[PDB]
Design a protein around this motif. Structure first.
Motif, PDB file in Angstrom:
ATOM      1  N   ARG A  53       0.827  -1.201   0.000  1.00  8.14           N
ATOM      2  CA  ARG A  53       0.000   0.000   0.000  1.00  8.14           C
ATOM      3  C   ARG A  53       0.866   1.257   0.000  1.00  8.14           C
ATOM      4  NH1 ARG A  53      -1.481   2.965   4.280  1.00  8.14           N
ATOM      5  NH2 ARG A  53      -1.135   1.267   5.786  1.00  8.14           N
ATOM      6  N   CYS A  83       0.764   5.495  -0.972  1.00  5.00           N
ATOM      7  CA  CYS A  83      -0.021   6.673  -1.322  1.00  5.00           C
ATOM      8  C   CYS A  83       0.782   7.616  -2.212  1.00  5.00           C
ATOM      9  CB  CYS A  83      -0.469   7.407  -0.056  1.00  5.00           C
ATOM     10  SG  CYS A  83      -1.372   6.359   1.131  1.00  5.00           S
ATOM     11  N   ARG A  84       0.080   8.509  -2.902  1.00  2.00           N
ATOM     12  CA  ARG A  84       0.727   9.468  -3.791  1.00  2.00           C
ATOM     13  C   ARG A  84      -0.082  10.759  -3.878  1.00  2.00           C
ATOM     14  NH1 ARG A  84       0.893   6.956  -9.603  1.00  2.00           N
ATOM     15  NH2 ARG A  84       0.069   8.989 -10.275  1.00  2.00           N
ATOM     16  N   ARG A 133      -4.102  12.520  -3.434  1.00  2.00           N
ATOM     17  CA  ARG A 133      -3.553  11.541  -2.504  1.00  2.00           C
ATOM     18  C   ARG A 133      -4.309  10.219  -2.599  1.00  2.00           C
ATOM     19  NH1 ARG A 133      -4.652  14.574   3.148  1.00  2.00           N
ATOM     20  NH2 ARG A 133      -3.345  16.174   2.149  1.00  2.00           N
ATOM     21  N   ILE A 134      -3.806   9.315  -3.433  1.00  2.00           N
ATOM     22  CA  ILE A 134      -4.433   8.012  -3.616  1.00  2.00           C
ATOM     23  C   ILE A 134      -3.477   6.884  -3.242  1.00  2.00           C
ATOM     24  CG2 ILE A 134      -5.819   8.949  -5.492  1.00  2.00           C
ATOM     25  CD1 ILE A 134      -4.079   7.517  -7.459  1.00  2.00           C
ATOM     26  N   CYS A 135      -4.000   5.875  -2.554  1.00  2.00           N
ATOM     27  CA  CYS A 135      -3.194   4.735  -2.135  1.00  2.00           C
ATOM     28  C   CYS A 135      -3.663   3.456  -2.824  1.00  2.00           C
ATOM     29  CB  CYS A 135      -3.264   4.564  -0.617  1.00  2.00           C
ATOM     30  SG  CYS A 135      -3.146   6.126   0.313  1.00  2.00           S
ATOM     31  N   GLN A 136      -2.714   2.703  -3.370  1.00  2.00           N
ATOM     32  CA  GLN A 136      -3.029   1.456  -4.058  1.00  2.00           C
ATOM     33  C   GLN A 136      -1.874   0.467  -3.949  1.00  2.00           C
ATOM     34  OE1 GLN A 136      -3.633   2.418  -8.182  1.00  2.00           O
ATOM     35  NE2 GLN A 136      -1.444   2.677  -8.603  1.00  2.00           N
TER      36      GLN A 136
END
Lengths: 12, 12
Positions: free
Chosen positions: A9, A11-12, B1-4
């Motif tokens: 996991r 984030c960005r 801000r997305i987490c994958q």
């Protein structure tokens, strides 16, 4: 001592 | 801000 691709996991 | 989940080179 082994290196391999694994999902994590991040984030960005 | 997305987490994958993503593959990455990790040693142990």
């Amino acid at each position: 001592r082994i290196c391999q691709f694994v999902l994590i996991r991040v984030c960005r």
